[PDB]
Amino acid sequence: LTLSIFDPVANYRAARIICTIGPSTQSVEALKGLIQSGMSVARMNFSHGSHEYHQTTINNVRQAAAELGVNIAIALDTKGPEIRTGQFVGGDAVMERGATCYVTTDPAFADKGTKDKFYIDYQNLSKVVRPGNYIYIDDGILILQVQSHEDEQTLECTVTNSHTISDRRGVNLPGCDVDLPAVSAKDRVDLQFGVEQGVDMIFASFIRSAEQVGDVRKALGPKGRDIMIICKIENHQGVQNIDSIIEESDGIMVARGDLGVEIPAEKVVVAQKILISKCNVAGKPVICATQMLESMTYNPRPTRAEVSDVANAVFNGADCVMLSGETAKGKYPNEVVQYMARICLEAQSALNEYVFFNSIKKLQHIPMSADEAVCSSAVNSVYETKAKAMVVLSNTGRSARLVAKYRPNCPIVCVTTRLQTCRQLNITQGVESVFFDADKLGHDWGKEHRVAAGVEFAKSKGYVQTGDYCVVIHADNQTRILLVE
Amino acid sequence: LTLSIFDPVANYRAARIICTIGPSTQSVEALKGLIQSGMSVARMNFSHGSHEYHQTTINNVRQAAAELGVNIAIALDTKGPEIRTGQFVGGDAVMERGATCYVTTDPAFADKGTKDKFYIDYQNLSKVVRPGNYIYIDDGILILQVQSHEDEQTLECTVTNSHTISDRRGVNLPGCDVDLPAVSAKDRVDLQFGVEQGVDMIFASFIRSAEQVGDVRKALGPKGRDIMIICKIENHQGVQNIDSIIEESDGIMVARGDLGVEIPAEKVVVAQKILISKCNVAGKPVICATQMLESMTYNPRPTRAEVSDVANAVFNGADCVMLSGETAKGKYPNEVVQYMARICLEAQSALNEYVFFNSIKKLQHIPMSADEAVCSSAVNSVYETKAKAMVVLSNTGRSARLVAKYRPNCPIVCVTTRLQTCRQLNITQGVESVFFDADKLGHDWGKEHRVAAGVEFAKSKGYVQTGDYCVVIHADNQTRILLVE
Amino acid sequence: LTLSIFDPVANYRAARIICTIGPSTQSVEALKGLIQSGMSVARMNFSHGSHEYHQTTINNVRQAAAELGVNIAIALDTKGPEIRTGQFVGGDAVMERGATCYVTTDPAFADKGTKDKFYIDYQNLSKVVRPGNYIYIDDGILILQVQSHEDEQTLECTVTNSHTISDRRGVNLPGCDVDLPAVSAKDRVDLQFGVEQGVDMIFASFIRSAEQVGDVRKALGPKGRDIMIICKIENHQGVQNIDSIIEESDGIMVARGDLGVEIPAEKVVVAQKILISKCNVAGKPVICATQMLESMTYNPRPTRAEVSDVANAVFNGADCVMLSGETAKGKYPNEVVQYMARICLEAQSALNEYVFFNSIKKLQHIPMSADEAVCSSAVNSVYETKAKAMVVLSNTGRSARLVAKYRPNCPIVCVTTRLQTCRQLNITQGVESVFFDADKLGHDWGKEHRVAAGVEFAKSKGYVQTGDYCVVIHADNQTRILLVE
Amino acid sequence: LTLSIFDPVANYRAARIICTIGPSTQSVEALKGLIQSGMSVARMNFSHGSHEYHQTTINNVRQAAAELGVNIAIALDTKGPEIRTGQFVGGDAVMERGATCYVTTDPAFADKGTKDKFYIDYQNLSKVVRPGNYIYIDDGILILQVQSHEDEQTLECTVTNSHTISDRRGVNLPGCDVDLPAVSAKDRVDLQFGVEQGVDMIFASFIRSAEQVGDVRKALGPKGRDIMIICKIENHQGVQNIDSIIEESDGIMVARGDLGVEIPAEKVVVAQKILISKCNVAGKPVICATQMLESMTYNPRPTRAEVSDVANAVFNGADCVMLSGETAKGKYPNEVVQYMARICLEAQSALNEYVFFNSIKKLQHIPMSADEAVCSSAVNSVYETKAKAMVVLSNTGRSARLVAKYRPNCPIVCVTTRLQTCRQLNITQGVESVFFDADKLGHDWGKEHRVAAGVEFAKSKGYVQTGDYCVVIHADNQTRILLVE
């Protein structure tokens, strides 16, 4: 099975890079550097910083993008309802294996935390937890066991294993009945902002059921109905309910570290593998959020261990990689994005599509909807004609997504009148936007001009020469195989 | 493999019936009876009857068809260059196993033939054959062996096996170098007639090489370029060169009896099977010319042995059955065609197409031509949408053929401005014509009206109700999945 | 799918011939002629002739076989419980479409039957049937409709369609509640005889349920437990309950004619096809009892229509053909069996086994029994080693059957101490017996000698030369790949 | 494709651990700790240490193994002919991007090396290299460019990129004609030792052609004919000639780092993937030598990045992992081997074998040898019977290897009279040895006792209870499916 080689990998078919903006990269000029290095999506991290701060980024991103004549997606990454620790006096708190320590629901200790007594923001912890229970902190790396109630606000605990933990970390309480909301009050206000400022997508945190996804859309409301929702799978319950979450969302974001208590470290790879196959079949994008290339926060060149780490992530099927602190607070923002790009390009080698397409087709429920039947059939035509680019006229972009789903061995070029659609398509691998100005240009029930606009593009990008074939779609339902002029 | 049932088989998907016109059926009224019983094609047999006779049939067929408001194809079945015997004094000649007899190239004995001395129309036989050689007569059923030259015109022969033979029978001479023309002088004049009288297809006789097919088209000339050529495979050399003959012709006609010397009786089934698969893959029609239901030349009801004979022929994959003497000189012309119809319908049972289509697709040479890629992809869309009829706008009909090739599980409805195309489509299983009057109707670069004309038809024939899907093609290259109104 | 050729077909892999003994062939000398022509099984037809008559055949068969030094199976073909007509004064009765006629349950008319009034042996017919019901006679070819009761013994009827019927024909009464026994009183006495005279197999008639098969074995009793039961499928109910009947019997016998009312003539082929696939998967033999080559009852040479008839029957997958009147009362008994043999040989051409074996393997229920797992695995080894004969040591022969089931591309040679097993293996295609005299020879827990006895045989029959591989089995569980000496 | 889960993974089917002995682990007691933690193979690294040192290890390993009553393989890992640097005055040499430096073939500088002038042991370097050429040092991480000859012994060079390098590192010279021997003089003497001291396998270094493998065996000679040769693929030429090297060796060892110049860092994963599939098909073991878990040289607990690193390595198909400095000179030798074991166990999850076996079978050249045909067929029997352990009687162990090749879903238990075979089987995944004392026990042409010895084992290890099936082999050719008592 598969006798691969090491040669082509053309410029398209590379994975997509999401950059987290921070002090290192908020400037218009730094953002121009990011865009030029390979940024497709600017990610805002709403667990930190005021609305004024994020307002600035939105402005800067838009200005940088406009200056470079490109469309870059802005993404609101929510804080989420997950229970967190307070902050600590030092840079952190140092936990020791034998030690006993205290945990409080008293707001007084939120800004005062220490290795001996610190704060947890779940104001009802005392009522839910019982002596003998395990409190898992910081991706369940540090484990505490509850000994007794010191008072109606404080719990006596033992440190199960040595580990050093920093400010505001995730607390997990399995074996405790905790019905946390789908959306926190802070999320509710942040989502209003997102809607009002015209963001492209929400990276929803701590989703564990499909029902909770609907809650997020209900918060976004009628005005936010065109905003995509990408779901973070972070604990066991999310993994448990993935099937329902996938086909009820617009994508999935997963992180090797941040997968929760009940998945042991060694079976984390297994889950990554499964979740990627599960998304690839359903045709929705999977964002690899695990932080590789961490050394490049202080170093201009990475390590071959980190290179192989990204390679595997890519080679396995990830469509998007996401950079955190490296772009947000790191020393070499541009150099990081440039290596990602090269690795996302060069580590795509064996990625099959010829029989890979026919496998996804066999796994969809017949009878499929008319527009989906169109798109797959079109991909079919590409392999049959052995050529060579695709032109899709799509307003909401749904048709471009549907085609990508059936992974053709040629570039997909979407032609759109919605500027939002240009941006939102960044997180779809192997698809490129061509904006057609519905106002300034005008007429095209032809639909002459905008098709030619696609072919004009593909030609200039070096995809199609005179004599090549090109497959065209106008679905909601039309298909055409076109000889290049 | 295949757990079949016995239930549906709707009206389409039945094989097509070709009727040989003769004294019993030349009348306009009898032809109306044939059309109503199930005739798709009137076949003229040019080995008999003057041009005046065949002129009459052509006229009658056209008048019968017009009166019933239908399009029936007229087919010229050539005599061919195969060497034949003379005629005999009795009804026949009775050959006896021990006997010695004489064979002449002297025209004097052509109308005088007898069991003891008869005529062969190969004026050069004496020069080619050597003592010890076998002369095979009447489908190689009677075998003679040459003993000596009696003179420069007559050969002394032994009867190898007892058999009774009638007038003008086929002579085969393997182990003798005989370069017979692709086309006889009589064929040359008959083909002019065919062209001048606007026939739909030639049933070319004794084709043994692809090169000979080109000779037939050269005879038909520029005016006859739209006339289809169906090739008769009758001897070993044809079977040997089938691959080349198939994809260089418009179809193949084969007869269990008439397959020649070098294929033993028991390995005749094997050949039938092979030739049918070979055509079905190349997408061209195969006409089963073997005469089943012979008893119905004198009887109103057939025998269950003959019923099972046709069944097998159909169930194996034949697209057309052909009736000879039963329609031409038989007592019950209508009743024969009616049983064929019922058997061609009811014996179609298990005929798969779901994975059968995907097998033919896998066997075509990539990269296929744009119009072929379109048609297969369209068939693909039918199964994906699970519905329900096809509308193809085709001028020469090539596109309808290409779709049939990929055997969809729905009826194909062709819309055409060429009246010739209506006729020529009779020999394609599962395809129906809708004539669109280019002159009287007029405008349709829309191409609004004629598409609706197809859907109008499919609706009335009971294929498509409100809510069903229908797949549409305008290839040479367009495809559309359409919701029924 | 399948690009066949016309070349090999070695002597094994031919289908097996069953001959019906009658006046033409009861003599020891005629039976020697049959054996030499290709008879594997002598069939006795217990619907005719006294026990003394059948006693003679049994004796003659055994004497002929012993003289020629071979083992020929004797088969008791039961009369069965199906309702039959009486006999008629003439040679027959001539039924006419308009006519009215009378049917009696009065024994007085059993030997007196006529076109106007005749007898039916169901002594309760009057109580079961209602005016308007259809009586189907002679394979449902002649159809009557009941008009009224003439008396408590006679029914007034109309002839629905013209047909001529002879003595003692099958009556079918669907739409009438008739619980006929699994076994008639005459069957009960005949089966005792069968057991007492050491027959090899029963051809059980009119089986319509698996439960009825058990009734047949119950009649045969403890002494008859090694006698195989072959089930005749003759009506709709048998076809309905086939799955259960197949895996509860030792084989199936089917006849194109004799399939019953509810299967129309054209859908008879469909059933043949299904039943053959159904048996081939379950690995049990299917006997084609339909009478082809009927003309050879009076003629030394058959017709190419009959040749193609047998060809199809064979090419489709039949393992046994059965001759009736042709061997029993025909003019040319030997010549018939000789043509069958040649057709069964030469019409085997394309019969695949390479991927055909792997399809049957995929369709068996895992986990299979140890001995079955052994046999299939052994067949697997043959293809892997590309050689070349199989030696199976089997006492009851079960292991030889199991191997045949997985259709290897080499001859199977069974070595057995049971002389009954030699005979019973005649109805298994591609398997040959080697008798090993347990008494006279003796020792072989080796199991040295008897394995060598198999290899000795295969070598002499021209299967294996020095250097070839040969696969050996002793299952109930052992397998060995052996280099030839 | 593949809807995995996270549950079973029983104790067998885990990958195998190879430990490099050094100061931390040479003691008998430390070796007992290694064996108990999961060591299957002690690896000696002959690029360091005198023969006396390695003599000690051999003794200690054997004593530790005997005390624990187990068989542990000893492996000689050769130094190899690859060109190396000298050593440096400091701990290392620090190379700087702009700098110019000098390289000498003068032995005087071998023990004196510095960042400005150091030594290379290729005494002919001056004659081969030309100005402008690139010298690649330390896995081609540091790159130099030749400027000129300073003298007949020294080259002037520029440092292409900053990197710090330590003692005696690998030098690669592509674009230079260097015919290095297959075996160095030091290798020649070391291989004599290996033979004389009864090692189990050689880990041959710097093999780039199949022809060179034969040279290694020629060095080992008649006495060393039972010693397995595992080939290190370290440069492009090895990768180029892999097909020939694989089926001409006894295994392959590969290291993510140590793959050479011409494979860029990002396309290293691609090669790993290919080489593992290539070995798995040919059925030979692949040793992953890349150093994961490096942090555990100084830390008791690893990092989840290293855990995921091993996971991928395992999950991809590696049969053996190899530990270097961690066991040789590390602080926590036991704890390292214990984590490997847990990761090699728990990260095996999805590893399919049901259809995975049938894919390897389809890719072997028919006709296969009798003994190979036996083994695959036996594996076939396991799935068919759904049970449950395998017992293989094998003298050289070849048969156990052949069975493993066809990856059964049950444990394989080999029974052997050769104590060397016990050891050598450690590097085969999923196979376990049972030693049968040919001298002390004695008789078994039965072959009763030793089969029972296998079943005795499987029962005690908890594989087989009363009622389970067990498949048995004595190939060179016998197979048996056995019910457990």
Side-chain angles (χ1 to χ4, degrees), chain A residues 368 376-377 380-381 384 479, chain B residues 361 368 376-377 381 384 479:
Chain A
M368 49 203 293
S376 68
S377 287
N380 205 225
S381 298
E384 285 176 301
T479 323
Chain B
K361 208 256 268 184
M368 49 203 293
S376 68
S377 287
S381 298
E384 285 176 301
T479 323

Side-chain angles (χ1 to χ4, degrees), chain C residues 197-266:
Chain C
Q197 300 314 309
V199 301
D200 303 289
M201 56 221 201
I202 274 78
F203 289 168
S205 306
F206 218 69
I207 267 70
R208 42 254 192 259
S209 75
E211 203 247 51
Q212 289 173 350
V213 180
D215 290 308
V216 164
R217 208 166 288 119
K218 198 271 285 86
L220 289 160
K223 299 171 191 284
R225 91 194 88 103
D226 291 324
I227 303 170
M228 303 187 299
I229 302 161
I230 284 70
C231 294
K232 283 165 149 182
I233 308 302
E234 298 183 346
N235 76 113
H236 83 109
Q237 198 177 115
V239 180
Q240 184 176 347
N241 296 331
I242 191 125
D243 287 7
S244 39
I245 288 157
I246 289 178
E247 53 86 78
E248 226 263 339
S249 75
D250 299 298
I252 255 84
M253 176 169 32
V254 78
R256 159 215 276 169
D258 189 28
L259 268 165
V261 182
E262 291 181 67
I263 299 98
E266 30 277 88

Side-chain angles (χ1 to χ4, degrees), chain B residues 117-132:
Chain B
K117 189 183 186 178
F118 65 93
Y119 171 81
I120 283 180
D121 75 325
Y122 189 61
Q123 216 64 6
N124 210 219
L125 177 64
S126 305
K127 287 183 179 283
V128 181
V129 73
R130 209 80 79 258

Side-chain angles (χ1 to χ4, degrees), chain B residues 73-87:
Chain B
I74 302 176
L76 196 161
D77 184 296
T78 165
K79 182 169 180 278
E82 175 168 22
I83 312 156
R84 291 189 210 279
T85 72
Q87 50 217 161

Side-chain angles (χ1 to χ4, degrees), chain C residues 368 376-377 380-381 384 479, chain D residues 361 368 376-377 380-381 384 479:
Chain C
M368 49 203 293
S376 68
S377 287
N380 205 225
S381 298
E384 285 176 301
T479 323
Chain D
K361 208 256 268 184
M368 49 203 293
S376 68
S377 287
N380 205 225
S381 298
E384 285 176 301
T479 323

